[PDB]
Design a protein around this ligand. Structure first.
Ligand SMILES: Cc1cc(C)c(S(=O)(=O)Nc2ccc3c(c2)nc(CCCCCCCNC(=O)C[C@]24C[C@H]5C[C@H](C[C@H](C5)C2)C4)n3Cc2ccccc2)c(C)c1
Length: 263
């Protein structure tokens, strides 16, 4: 019940998502693993981790107790490698989309720098098991050892909406094409592009979501996209704080998060 431009546009986002989202994480390899002001940082920073091997073996990691020291950072190198893997997917996803690639390159970079975290969280939501509190990433699993944390309330509430793959990819596009981000020059171009992604989403819900439970679903999604933006800003600052006292960000994280390499 969509216009043909609207069906074309979903098809292109779904295609880009299919080509760049490793749902089984098969190619996440060569990552690091745990071995064998700071008042804010302890409050900023756990997760247990499991690795299924190709042979049927399992390794399980239970994190340490907080004891006022360098043990709260032990999982960060591994998360840095996972995040970098996701960001590569995110960047590839954007580069595949015609509307993104028709922009000037300064703006592309600025948009990617502005939304990478948000698109990473949106992809992670689709592998979040809300019944076990576990992110199920192929051979890897990350389980939580409550919902006062705003990122984590977001994941539970987004998962409760039982969204389609098409709605997830439209949410990704809206977040990507956000005219309100630092260094965007084609402000109005991007705003009009965003408007078409949002209207396609509203029309998609209208056509395939007639049940009373999906009343106001478009508006619920748009408000979660807005929450996710404020959460993005907040988590950008947690990262910078922890990065300041215990460096951990990979070169790709540095580029995406503003770190220049010069003290
Ligand atoms: C200091 C820091 C900051 C940022 C900004 C990033 S990034 O986006 O570049 N990456 C990333 C990647 C995945 C994330 C994530 C952030 N948050 C989340 C949201 C879920 C957890 C909600 C708790 C709210 C924040 N509780 C923290 O203390 C920050 C954490 C820093 C790292 C990564 C992640 C687990 C653990 C270690 C705590 C979030 N998941 C989902 C997830 C978590 C664990 C395994 C798989 C997937 C990193 C790696 C570190």
């Amino acid at each position: 019940g969509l216009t043909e431009e609207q069906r074309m546009m979903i098809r292109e986002l779904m295609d880009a998502q299919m080509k760049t989202f490793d749902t089984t994480f098969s190619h996440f390899k060569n990552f690091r693993l745990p071995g064998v002001k700071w008042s804010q940082v302890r409050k900023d920073l756990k997760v247990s981790l499991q690795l299924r091997g190709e042979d049927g073996s399992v390794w399980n990691y239970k994190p340490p107790a907080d004891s006022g020291g360098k043990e709260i950072f032990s999982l960060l190198p591994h998360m840095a490698d996972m995040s970098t893997y996701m960001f590569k997917g995110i960047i590839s996803f954007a580069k595949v989309i015609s509307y993104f690639r028709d922009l000037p390159i300064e703006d592309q970079i600025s948009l990617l720098k502005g939304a990478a975290f948000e698109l990473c969280q949106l992809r992670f939501n689709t592998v979040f098991n809300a019944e076990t509190g576990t992110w199920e990433c192929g051979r890897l699993s990350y389980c939580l050892e409550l919902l006062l944390e705003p990122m984590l309330k977001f994941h539970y509430m987004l998962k409760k909406l039982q969204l389609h793959e098409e709605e997830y990819v439209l949410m990704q596009a809206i977040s990507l094409f956000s005219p309100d981000r630092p260094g965007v020059l084609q402000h109005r171009v991007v705003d009009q592009l965003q408007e078409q992604f949002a209207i396609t989403l509203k029309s998609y819900i209208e056509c395939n979501r007639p049940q009373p439970a999906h009343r106001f679903l478009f508006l619920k999604i748009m408000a979660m996209l807005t929450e996710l933006r404020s959460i993005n800003a907040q988590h950008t600052q947690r990262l910078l704080r922890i990065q300041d006292i215990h460096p951990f960000a990979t070169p790709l994280m540095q580029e995406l998060f503003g770190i220049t390499g010069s003290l």
